[PDB]
Amino acid sequence: TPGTLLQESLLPREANYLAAIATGDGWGLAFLDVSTGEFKGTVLKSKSALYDELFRHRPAEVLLAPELLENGAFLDEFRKLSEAPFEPEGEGPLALRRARGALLAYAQRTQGGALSLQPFRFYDPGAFMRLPEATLRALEVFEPLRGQDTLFSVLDETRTAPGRRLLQSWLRHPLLDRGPLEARLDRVEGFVREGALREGVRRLLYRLADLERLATRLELGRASPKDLGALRRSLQILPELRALLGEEVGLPDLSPLKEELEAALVEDPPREEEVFLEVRERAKRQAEALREAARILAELDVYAALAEVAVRYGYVRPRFGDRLQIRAGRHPVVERRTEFVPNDLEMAHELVLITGPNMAGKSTFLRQTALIALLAQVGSFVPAEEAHLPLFDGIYTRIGAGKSTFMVEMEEVALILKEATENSLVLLDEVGRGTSSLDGVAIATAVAEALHERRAYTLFATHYFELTALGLPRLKNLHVAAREEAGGLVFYHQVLPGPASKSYGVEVAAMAGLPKEVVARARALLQAM
Amino acid sequence: ANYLAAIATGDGWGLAFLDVSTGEFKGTVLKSKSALYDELFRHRPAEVLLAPELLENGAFLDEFRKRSEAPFEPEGEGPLALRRARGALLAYAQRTQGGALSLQPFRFYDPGAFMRLPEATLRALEVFEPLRGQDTLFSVLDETRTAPGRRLLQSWLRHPLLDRGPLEARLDRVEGFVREGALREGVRRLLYELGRASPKDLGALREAARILAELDVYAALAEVAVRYGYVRPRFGDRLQIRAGRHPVVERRTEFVPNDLEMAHELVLITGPNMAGKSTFLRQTALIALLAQVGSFVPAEEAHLPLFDGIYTRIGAGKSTFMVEMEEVALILKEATENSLVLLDEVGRGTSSLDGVAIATAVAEALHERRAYTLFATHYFELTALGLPRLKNLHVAAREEAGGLVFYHQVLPGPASKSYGVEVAAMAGLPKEVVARARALLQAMAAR
C-alpha cells in the first residue's frame, strides 16, 4: 500500500498517509502513516471541509466505507481506493472509529503483523487559521501554479526529514492565539541574534538520522543493523547540540545506548546475530526517549531553519495588533527570481479596491499580502521592512484560473461570503467577469458591499471603475499605473493610493500589437461613450 | 515520424527537418519568426541545431530556451539559410550515424500553399494534444493499422488542403471503402539502403509502402466513420452543418448535436456559458479541419467551403489580457475573406467600456474582412450593431426544477434576457447578495 509503505527507501522527508472515510454523526477522516506511525483522524460535517482536510494531508491511498462504495453517485464524484472493513474500534464518534479501525485492520493486513502506533490524536480544523484548497493553490504554497518554486521550497531550509515534516505541518496548520506564535517568533529570533549558535546546530544536524522514523521501526522489529549505525552516529551529535544551547533544551541523556553501540558495532554495519539483537533490545529500551529527541529536535531544525532563511533573505519579525501595515513588503515566492520593487499597505477591516491595468503587480500584490499574513501566522519573519498584521481567522481567495470559469468563480465567492467574517482576510480579483456588460458591473457591486458590510479585510482588485466610486464608509482606493513611454507603456510595480484616473484598456490593447485603425476605431467608440 | 531540426539565418529563416528512421528530408525558409517557431511547432523536433549567429546572440538564445553544436556549411542548391541548416543535419547525422545516410529527395515545402494552422489553434482544438483529459482529434481518428499510414495521416492533419480538386479526390476515395464494407474489411484485416536491415526484418517483409499507408488510412478513417458514425462533407461556398458534433467530446457522453449555416458572415453567440458555446465553436473548426484533412466528419449532412486558414482565440510576464490581444492581432493580421475565425469573449478581463469597446472594433474589423467568423460573446451591445453580414445565435439556460437547466442547443436570434446574476445566484451566491444584485441590475437596466 502506497499508504502502508514502511521502508525508508520509498518515503520522502515529508509525511505520507493512508486515509479512511466513514460516515455517521459527521464525516470520519482517519489519517495514518506506517513510517512515522503517525495516527490522527477527525470528524467533519461539511463535505466541503472534508475533501479539504483530505486535500491538505494529500493521502496516497483512501479507504471508503461501504455506504460510499455502493453510492455510485458519490463514488464517481470522488473519482473526478482499496477495500477493507470499517469495524468501529476504540472510543469516539461513530464515523471516526469506523474509519480509524479501517486503517488498523488494513495496515496490519499490509504489515504481515502488528503495527507501532502513536497515541491517536484528535485535531480540529477550527482552532487553526482557515486555509482552503484553492487558497493553498492560489498562493502557490506547496505546489507552483506554473513554474518551479513555491513558498515551501523557498522556506525549505530544514536539515532533517523530521523537521521538514514538522515545518510542513505548521504550514498546513497556521495558528490563531498570539501566545503560541510569539513563543515561536521569540525562539526564531533566537538563532538569528545568535548567528554562531545557529551555525553550530545547523552544521551538526546535517546528515542526522531520522530518529523519528528510526525509533518507529524499533517498536516494529525491522530496525536493521545499518540503522543503528546511523543512530549511533546520531546519538553522538546529541551531546554536541546540547553543548551549544544548554541543559535547557531538555534533550535526554542517551549516552548509555550510545556507548553500547560504539563497542558492539562495526564502523560500517553491513552468534553474531544473537549478539546483534541483544544490543538492539538494549537500544529499543529507549524507544520513546528517541521519538522524544526527534520531536524536540525538529523544532530547533525549523526554528533555526526559517530563521536562517529570514536572515538569508531579510525577513522582519512581524508585530500583531488590530491594523494591517506593510512597510515595503515583498512576494517571498517571486522575490527569489528577480529585482522586486517592494510596496506598502494599510488597512483596518476595510474594502480596498485595486485598479489600473494588469501587468503592474495587482494580482501578485494581493498574494504578496496573503503570504505575509500566512508567513506571520505560521511563525516566521516575513519579506518586508516593518509589518503590522492583525490575527486573521481565515485567508480565503478567488484568484486567476463540466462547468465554466464563471460558475466556478461564483461558487468561489459564495464560500467567501459564506465563511468570511470581520476578521477574515479576503482577496478578490475581477470577481464577476466572463459575463455580459451590466451583470458584470452588477455582481461586482453586490459582492463588494456584501463584503464591505462584513467589515472583513478585503483587497478586492478590479477594473470596474463604477465600483471605485461607491461612497461607503469603509472603502478605499489604490491603483497601479502603466506609462506609454518609448516602448509603448511603462507600468510601475507601485500600488499608489487613490483610484486610477484614466482607463488603460484600449492602450494595453493597442500596445499588445493591435492594428492602428482598430485601436483608433476603438479609442473613438470609447470617447463616444 | 521524428525530426532533427536545424535553424540557419540568411534571406529568410532556414528550417531543416530530417529523420534518420524514415530518412525523410525536408526543410524550408520562413520570414516571420512567428511562422518559424510555428512550423517548428507542428513538426515538434526532439533536437534542434542553431546556427553560429543565433548561438552567440545572448538574447535570441534565452528566448528560444524559454519557448547541440554543428557547422552549417551551405550544401546543395537553394536559399542560403536553407542550405546551411539543411547541411547542418547531414553533417550532424553523418557523424552520429558512423557513416553515410540514406535520404529521400529533399523536399522544400511552402506552408503558404495549404491551410494555415497556428500553434495555439492546434492547442485550442485539442488536435494532437489534449487541453485537459485524455482524448484528441488524433486518437479518435487514430484507426490506422501501419506506422506508415499513421505518419501519413498525421501529415495531412499538420497540413490541411486548399484546392477542391485534391480534397474531392480524397473524399471520393474515402467514400470508396465505405460503400464497399467488405472491401474495407479485407485490406484492414490484411494490413494488420543504410545497410542495417537485419535478418528478422526480412522475415516480416518505400513506394509501395507509401501507397499502402495511404490505403492503411483510407480504411482507418472509414472504420472510424463507421464505428463513430460520421458522414462525407461536400464542399462549396456555404457552411451548413446538419446535426454536427464535437468528435472529441462525442466519445465520452450523450451529445446533443446542433446545426449551423454561414457565408462569409459574422455570427455572434450569446446566452450563458455552460450551454455549449465554446465547445460549439470548436465543434465547427474540427469538422472544417476533419474535412480539409480528408475524413468523414461527425454530422448528418455538412457543406463546408475551402477555408484557407483556421485561426482561434479560445479559453486560457504578461497577463491573460495582453496575450489574448496579440492573439486577435494575428487573426486580424492573417484572416481573409476565406479564413475561418472563432472568437470567444474577445476583449474581457478589462474595465467596463474598454471591454464593450474593443469587442465592437474587432467585430466590424472581422465583419469588413468578410471572413467566416463565429464570434461568441456575452456583450449584448455587440448583438445590436446593424451590419449587413451580422447574424445572431444564442444558447439558453433554464431555471427549472433545480436552479437552471442549461440547453446544449444553439438557436437563431440573440438571447432575450441576461443570465449573469442568474447563473451567479445559481452557482451558490447568498440570496441577499443576488437580490442586491438583481436590483442594481434592474436599476442600470432601465437606465
Swiss-Prot record, chain B:
ATP binds at G271, P272, N273, M274, A275, G276, K277, S278. One of its GO terms (biological process) is mismatch repair. Transmembrane segments: none annotated. The keyword Nucleus does not apply. GO terms for molecular function: ATP binding; ATP-dependent DNA damage sensor activity; damaged DNA binding; mismatched DNA binding. Keywords: ATP-binding, DNA damage, DNA repair, DNA-binding, Nucleotide-binding. The keyword Nucleotide-binding applies. This protein is involved in the repair of mismatches in DNA. It is possible that it carries out the mismatch recognition step. This protein has a weak ATPase activity. Belongs to the DNA mismatch repair MutS family. This is DNA mismatch repair protein MutS. It comes from Thermus aquaticus.
